[PDB]
């Protein structure tokens, strides 16, 4: 979806970079770990910058692992993380980039929203919508849908994959539901409000079939039961809103299907997590089904339902709004490059001063 | 006297022993490791109490949540399942600093710092967090923070003064008459100066003890 | 008498190890049976 | 002994002979033996009814107030004595135990009435 300018690497490739042989730098880091001594963030930065081959990436992956399991893991720099993804794309190692991103806990690769779009867009153009979905799920796990550009790309991948996937497993429903909900909340357009109702519906299905702990456990989601209540509220809000807002017809069918399925179904971690006084969600389904029909009637009466499919609505939204976002993000990208350049120079200067002092210390000693 | 003589071996022993302790200090990844099949700590062979078994299998530790987040979740809010069950009002930590245990192969053990908000009332300074190795922590989602942290304080209704005990009240009134003070005022105790925190209130981790490094 | 919500909070905390709930005690000491 | 750590406490030290208990209320370091070194004697407790049927407690309330003001803890039996005297409020378990006794005698009275009703059925059978 993104333009060639967005994914162009002329600016990154023109960065001022120090020339250090990887073999020499490898030895320095190896000695520090043998002596249980901290390694500098500038040291790991120089290694990633001077990667020159596909084989070198494999060695850097090992050293990024070592840095994560070292005293100075927190100091891994943003530009080092961005250069890693840029190097992986350059030499054809996209699988390695996705591998480290999925295994963030081990390697410490937490890219920014711009880097996420670069990796996610590569897969989209190649037609690998299974790997692109993995990037979307990783963005959701980190709750990093802040930049508008990432929200549009994530919704395009999700809806395109959902259309192909007629059958959804409970884990898939949970992952898709969370990704839709978090991305949808940011957007106030028709596509955004449809994704919120779509996301709450899927999560509500998993809540009433497998329990509320399946939804929130290990997920960036709340633990309070009543996800189908959140879905119905979206319908009630649009119907009563003074402004004219519309919910796609496709989502309304999904919620109707979920309500019907749940309504008429066919070691020591066994706890009742809800108070006895509070009504269980299953007992509330009869009332929930009445609200849905009433809301649907009011929406159709007010002509607030969009017959167009969600995949077609999202495609139009991406075409109209994504071009503007690319210009804004690219301007911020240039500013970040200059900020990173200055911060890197400061670290190099500070290193030189301490080394000079180290000579003076030995002279005194 | 002068027949009391030096004990060089005793002095040598004390210093030598203390040095080894500093050299061979254990790490959080070892002291707080657990065997989930038996719910027993391998280091000391200490089997966890019975009331904790369900949560040990059903809940996560703090740095298990934070290891998956950028910057180890600095600025994020974290609550405890025990607090969620006991108190209706929001109880959480606002993370400020986080020191993972690099030795751990998953960075799942360490220490953290933050600002406490217990039962809706927030402290003014950051301090170290206790019970970080417990299976009780729940990370709050960013989109749910505003609804989670919303609190409206109710007017305090717990009595501020109470009567004196029956005998101690009679001794006070008797002293009044003896000294010439004539009054019918009822002696009253003031409870504002001495109000007790809840029993589950977070304690000072900085002054807490740490287990020794001798395995059982 | 405890509030009803608080009695439910304790039934969840000690679920599986509970005793029959007791009501208000007799107003006076029952006369010893003889 | 040369103790390291501990706090001052007000407790009952057991005296007397076999089947004839007698207590001395004392302020003592908590780590000392029950009947060993103490700091001050603060009274006495005789738990056996005397000729008049009175259990006799003596409390030096001026010295007791002095040692509570200096950090002295209280043993649970001594907290019960101060509650009965009126110098302290009644201990929570003194009230809870009295409530348990009331609920336990109510059952006994009800059972006797049920037995009497069952005995009445026997009388009806003749
Ligand atoms: Mg405790």
UniProtKB/Swiss-Prot annotation, chain A:
The keyword Flavoprotein does not apply. One of its GO terms (cellular component) is mitochondrial inner membrane. Keywords: Coiled coil, Cytoplasm, Mitochondrion, Repeat, Ribonucleoprotein, Ribosomal protein, RNA-binding, rRNA-binding, Transit peptide, Translation regulation, tRNA-binding. The gene is Mrps27. It comes from the Eukaryota. The keyword Oxidoreductase does not apply. GO terms for biological process: cell population proliferation; mitochondrial translation; regulation of translation. PPR repeats lie at residues 77-111, 112-147. It is found in: Cytoplasm; Mitochondrion. Its main location: cytoplasm. Pfam families: MRP-S27. GO terms for molecular function: rRNA binding; tRNA binding. Component of the mitochondrial ribosome small subunit (28S) which comprises a 12S rRNA and about 30 distinct proteins. Interacts with NOA1. Interacts with MIEF1 upstream open reading frame protein. Interacts with METTL17. This is Small ribosomal subunit protein mS27. Residues 326-365 form a coiled coil. The lineage of its organism: Eukaryota, Metazoa, Chordata, Craniata, Vertebrata. Belongs to the mitochondrion-specific ribosomal protein mS27 family. RNA-binding component of the mitochondrial small ribosomal subunit (mt-SSU) that plays a role in mitochondrial protein synthesis. Stimulates mitochondrial mRNA translation of subunit components of the mitochondrial electron transport chain. Binds to the mitochondrial 12S rRNA (12S mt-rRNA) and tRNA(Glu). Overexpressed in hepatocellular carcinoma tissues compared with adjacent non-tumoral liver tissues.
UniProtKB/Swiss-Prot annotation, chain B:
Belongs to the mitochondrion-specific ribosomal protein mS34 family. Disulfide bonds: none annotated. Widely expressed (at protein liver). GO terms for biological process: mitochondrial translation. Required for mitochondrial translation, plays a role in maintaining the stability of the small ribosomal subunit and the 12S rRNA that are required for mitoribosome formation. Pfam families: MRP-S34. One of its GO terms (molecular function) is structural constituent of ribosome. Keywords: Mitochondrion, Ribonucleoprotein, Ribosomal protein. It comes from the Eukaryota. GO terms for cellular component: mitochondrial inner membrane; mitochondrial small ribosomal subunit; mitochondrion. Component of the mitochondrial ribosome small subunit (28S) which comprises a 12S rRNA and about 30 distinct proteins. This is Small ribosomal subunit protein mS34. It is found in: Mitochondrion.
Curated annotation (Swiss-Prot), chain C:
Residues 23-34 have a biased composition (Pro residues). It is found in: Mitochondrion. Belongs to the bacterial ribosomal protein bS18 family. Mitochondrion-specific ribosomal protein mS40 subfamily. Component of the mitochondrial ribosome small subunit (28S) which comprises a 12S rRNA and about 30 distinct proteins. This is Small ribosomal subunit protein mS40. The gene is Mrps18b.
UniProtKB/Swiss-Prot annotation, chain D:
Transmembrane segments: none annotated. It is found in: Mitochondrion. One of its GO terms (molecular function) is structural constituent of ribosome. Keywords: Mitochondrion, Ribonucleoprotein, Ribosomal protein, Transit peptide. GO terms for biological process: mitochondrial translation. InterPro entries: Ribosomal_bS16, Ribosomal_bS16_dom_sf. One of its GO terms (cellular component) is mitochondrial inner membrane. Residues 1-25 form a transit peptide. Belongs to the bacterial ribosomal protein bS16 family. Component of the mitochondrial ribosome small subunit (28S) which comprises a 12S rRNA and about 30 distinct proteins. NCBIfam families: S16 (TIGR00002). HAMAP family: Ribosomal_bS16 (MF_00385). This is Small ribosomal subunit protein bS16m. It comes from Mus musculus.
């Amino acid at each position: 979806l993104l333009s060639a300018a967005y994914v162009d690497s002329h600016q990154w490739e023109a960065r001022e970079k120090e020339e250090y042989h990887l073999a020499d730098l490898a030895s320095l880091m190896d000695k520090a770990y043998e002596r249980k001594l901290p390694v500098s963030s500038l040291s790991i930065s120089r290694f990633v910058d001077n990667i020159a081959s596909r084989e070198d990436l494999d060695s850097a992956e090992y050293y990024l692992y070592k840095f994560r399991h070292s005293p100075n893991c927190w100091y891994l720099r943003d530009w080092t993380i961005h250069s890693w993804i840029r190097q992986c794309l350059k030499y054809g190692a996209q699988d390695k980039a996705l591998y480290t991103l999925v295994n963030k806990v081990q390697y410490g690769i937490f890219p920014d929203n711009f880097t996420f779009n670069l990796l996610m867009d590569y897969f989209i153009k190649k037609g690998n919508y299974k790997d692109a979905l993995s990037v979307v799920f990783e963005i959701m796990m980190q709750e990093a849908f802040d930049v508008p550009s990432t929200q549009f790309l994530s919704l395009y991948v999700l809806y395109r994959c959902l259309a192909e996937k007629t059958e959804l497993t409970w884990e898939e429903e949970r992952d898709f539901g969370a990704s839709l909900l978090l991305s949808g909340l940011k957007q106030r357009n028709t596509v955004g409000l449809s994704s919120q109702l779509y996301g709450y519906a899927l999560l509500g299905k998993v809540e009433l079939q497998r329990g509320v702990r399946a939804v929130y456990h290990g997920m960036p989601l709340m633990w309070t039961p009543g996800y189908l209540d959140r879905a119905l509220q979206v319908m009630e809000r649009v119907a009563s809103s003074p402004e004219d807002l519309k919910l796609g017809r496709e989502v309304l069918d999904v919620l109707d299907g979920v309500l019907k399925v749940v309504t008429s179904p066919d070691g020591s971690a066994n706890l009742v997590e809800q108070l006895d006084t509070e009504e269980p969600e299953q007992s509330k389904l009869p009332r929930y089904l009445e609200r849905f029909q009433a809301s649907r009637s009011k929406l159709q009466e007010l002509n607030r339902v969009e017959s167009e499919s969600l995949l077609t609505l999202t495609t139009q939204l991406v075409k109209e709004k994504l071009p503007a976002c690319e210009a804004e993000d690219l301007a911020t990208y240039e500013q970040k490059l200059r900020e990173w350049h200055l911060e890197r120079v400061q670290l190099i200067q500070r290193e030189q001063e301490q080394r000079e002092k180290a000579k003076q210390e030995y002279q005194a000693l | 006297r002068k027949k009391v003589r030096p004990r060089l071996i005793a002095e040598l022993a004390r210093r030598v022993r203390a040095l080894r302790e500093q050299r061979n200090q254990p790490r959080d990844s070892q002291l707080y490791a657990l065997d989930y099949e038996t719910l027993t700590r391998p280091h000391s062979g200490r089997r966890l109490p019975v009331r904790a078994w369900a949560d040990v299998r059903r809940e996560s530790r703090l740095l298990q949540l934070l290891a998956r987040l950028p910057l180890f979740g600095l600025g994020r809010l974290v609550t405890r399942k025990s607090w969620l069950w006991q108190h209706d009002e929001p109880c959480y930590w606002r993370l400020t600093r986080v020191r993972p245990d690099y030795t751990a192969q998953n960075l799942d053990h360490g220490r953290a710092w933050g600002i406490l908000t217990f039962k809706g009332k927030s402290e003014d300074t950051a301090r170290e967090i206790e019970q970080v190795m417990y299976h009780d922590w729940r990370l709050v989602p960013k989109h749910e923070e505003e609804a989670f942290t919303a609190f409206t304080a109710k007017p305090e209704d717990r009595l501020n003064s109470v009567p004196y005990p029956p005998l101690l009240r009679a001794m006070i009134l008797a002293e009044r008459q003896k000294n010439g003070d004539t009054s019918v005022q009822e002696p009253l105790l003031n409870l504002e100066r001495t109000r007790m925190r809840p029993w589950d209130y977070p304690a000072k981790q900085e002054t807490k003890g740490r287990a020794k490094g001798t395995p059982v | 008498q405890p509030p009803e919500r608080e009695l439910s909070r304790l039934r969840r905390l000690y679920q599986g190890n509970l005793l029959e709930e007791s009501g208000p005690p007799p107003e006076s000491m029952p006369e010893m049976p003889t | 002994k040369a103790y390291h750590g501990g706090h001052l406490t007000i407790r009952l030290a057991l005296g007397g002979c076999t089947n004839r208990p007698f207590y001395r209320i004392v302020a003592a370091h908590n780590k000392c033996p029950r009947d060993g070194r103490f700091v001050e004697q603060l009274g006495s407790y005789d738990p056996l009814p005397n000729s008049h049927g009175e259990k006799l407690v003596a409390l030096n309330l001026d010295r007791i107030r002095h040692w509570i003001g200096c950090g002295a803890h209280l043993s649970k039996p001594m907290e019960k004595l101060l509650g009965l005297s009126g110098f302290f409020p009644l201990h929570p378990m003194m009230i809870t135990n009295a409530e348990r006794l009331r609920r336990r005698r109510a059952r006994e009275v009800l059972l006797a009435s049920q037995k009497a009703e069952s005995e009445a059925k026997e009388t009806e059978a003749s």
